[PDB]
Design a protein around this ligand. Structure first.
Ligand SMILES: Nc1nc(=O)c2ncn([C@@H]3O[C@@H]4COP(=O)(O)O[C@H]5[C@@H](O)[C@H](n6cnc7c(N)ncnc76)O[C@@H]5COP(=O)(O)O[C@@H]3[C@@H]4O)c2[nH]1
Ligand SMILES: Nc1nc(=O)c2ncn([C@@H]3O[C@@H]4COP(=O)(O)O[C@H]5[C@@H](O)[C@H](n6cnc7c(N)ncnc76)O[C@@H]5COP(=O)(O)O[C@@H]3[C@@H]4O)c2[nH]1
Ligand SMILES: Nc1nc(=O)c2ncn([C@@H]3O[C@@H]4COP(=O)(O)O[C@H]5[C@@H](O)[C@H](n6cnc7c(N)ncnc76)O[C@@H]5COP(=O)(O)O[C@@H]3[C@@H]4O)c2[nH]1
Lengths: 92, 92, 92, 92, 92, 92
């Protein structure tokens, strides 16, 4: 019970603050779905092109799965930073 | 006309690809609105607390405007990386 | 009371988990002190060298205050990522 | 001998500067130990929960090992940036 | 034809702008070659030292391939950010 | 003399290693010049458009100076990471 009191820097949050944090989290869920959809597109693109070496080489050179992972991490850490701006912990 | 042909690594894109890129951009617009709303909350919070030194010191120590800017940059660069995964330029 | 239940993805945490999170936060406090000490060194270095244009130009070109801010942000976001690995939210 | 003279932008450093850089490196060693401890916790958590599919799915969805790696990289690059603020190379 | 008009925020670009963007891309190609050369050095270093456990352990602890990948990503995203400063999309 | 021995994790470097590190630094100097050129373009663009509010608003919304600074930092930290892959310090 009341885990936050045990965590350093955590402070009490009002309903407005919690609602804003949850708004950020919800938008992120939409990004997650978009990322899954892009991953699904990539899976199809790769499959459609196996045996067509030129396209497989082009896709390997574009590295789209690596870039999608980069984007996912930036989206998640940006969400965390916005939420920190709302929640405002009293610690480094 | 056809600026992309002049830009290195840029390739022709199908309507499905362009639609996915635009989907990413649209979700980002929603993030922009959320960020503005958080900035507006912060402006109000600061204003409501001027002359209450303890709260002004607490807010200064939490640095919420800096964290909001950090989050904005991560959201934008993540969008760029997801869009690169869709668009797949043929260059470093 | 029990703010975490209202925040999406947040889950109950055991004492061991909270103790590890707090360990991360404590180490960060040590980094904060080190960063302040470096900022103090920089303030002195700059002061000692005003009127010695060559050194002031060299310091301006090294941009040490900007680099210290870069380091501070990376330390804080790394702390946040380690703490997320311990706390393990059930959301994007 | 005197490798630094051969490296562009590297400049001579006083004992105080070297001591501060080493202070940063030492604090980092403490972070390394903490990261290993978290990795050990994660290994145990996973092991304790194999055959309990719901928990294994939850852990896979939280991606704590990926987040721990993210945190490690941010800690290391932040250390590098703080050390650059102390050492102040005369190059881009 | 004219894919840019279909992509949100994309604007018409003059020849000077496109030439600057391509200048960035070209410099990046030079970085790609340097990165390949470093990867080749690492491959040789590892090979030359197999059976010399102490050196293999030292290399594993330095993690140079991971650091090279980190550097590659930072170079590519920095290129993207400079190009965005030139191209100036009218969107988030 | 021999400052590196006093810095933790620093190891002796061969001429080939130092030459590769310097190659990275040199390429970076080329990036610095390109960044200055882009900054100069931006200064001119802004100047040419003062009193044309629509263009000044568009430029303010694109935030090209902020994006150029983002790119500069990513280029510099990527250089640092590549150089760490060559130099291979024996510390966290
Ligand atoms: N002042 C204050 N009071 C709070 O109650 C509170 N709760 C969170 N925060 C801070 O918000 C910011 C963003 O949170 P996010 O959920 O994105 O990341 C969180 C989330 O991924 C995870 N986490 C924290 N608590 C829990 C929890 N109870 N369950 C699951 N995951 C958790 O660990 C990350 C980092 O936490 P901190 O980096 O220590 O504090 C956070 C951070 O500064 C708070 N700040
Ligand atoms: N002016 C100046 N004089 C110096 O003697 C000096 N030594 C280091 N630095 C700069 O400090 C900053 C942080 O150093 P860190 O050790 O975290 O990263 C270092 C470290 O990981 C690695 N490295 C450099 N020299 C060695 C070395 N001799 N042995 C092992 N690793 C080394 O390569 C990284 C990047 O070096 P640079 O990015 O070229 O210069 C560094 C950087 O700006 C110096 N700056
Ligand atoms: N205003 C404007 N008009 C343009 O014509 C234009 N073209 C690109 N940009 C923006 O430049 C910046 C850097 O571009 P880079 O090529 O590094 O990344 C690009 C590139 O990796 C990829 N991409 C975009 N279009 C194509 C394309 N036609 N073919 C291949 N890859 C493409 O997707 C990345 C992100 O694009 P955005 O993040 O939506 O817009 C870019 C970005 O802001 C433009 N901005």
């Amino acid at each position: 019970d009341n885990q936050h009191k045990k965590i350093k820097g955590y402070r009490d949050l009002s309903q407005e603050e919690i609602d804003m944090m949850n708004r950020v989290k919800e938008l992120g869920s939409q990004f997650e779905k978009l990322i899954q959809d892009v991953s699904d597109h990539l899976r199809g693109q790769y499959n459609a092109s196996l045996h067509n070496r030129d396209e497989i080489t082009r896709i390997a050179n574009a590295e789209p799965g690596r870039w999608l992972a980069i984007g996912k991490t930036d989206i998640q850490t940006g969400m965390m930073a916005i939420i920190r701006a709302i929640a405002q912990p009293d610690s480094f």
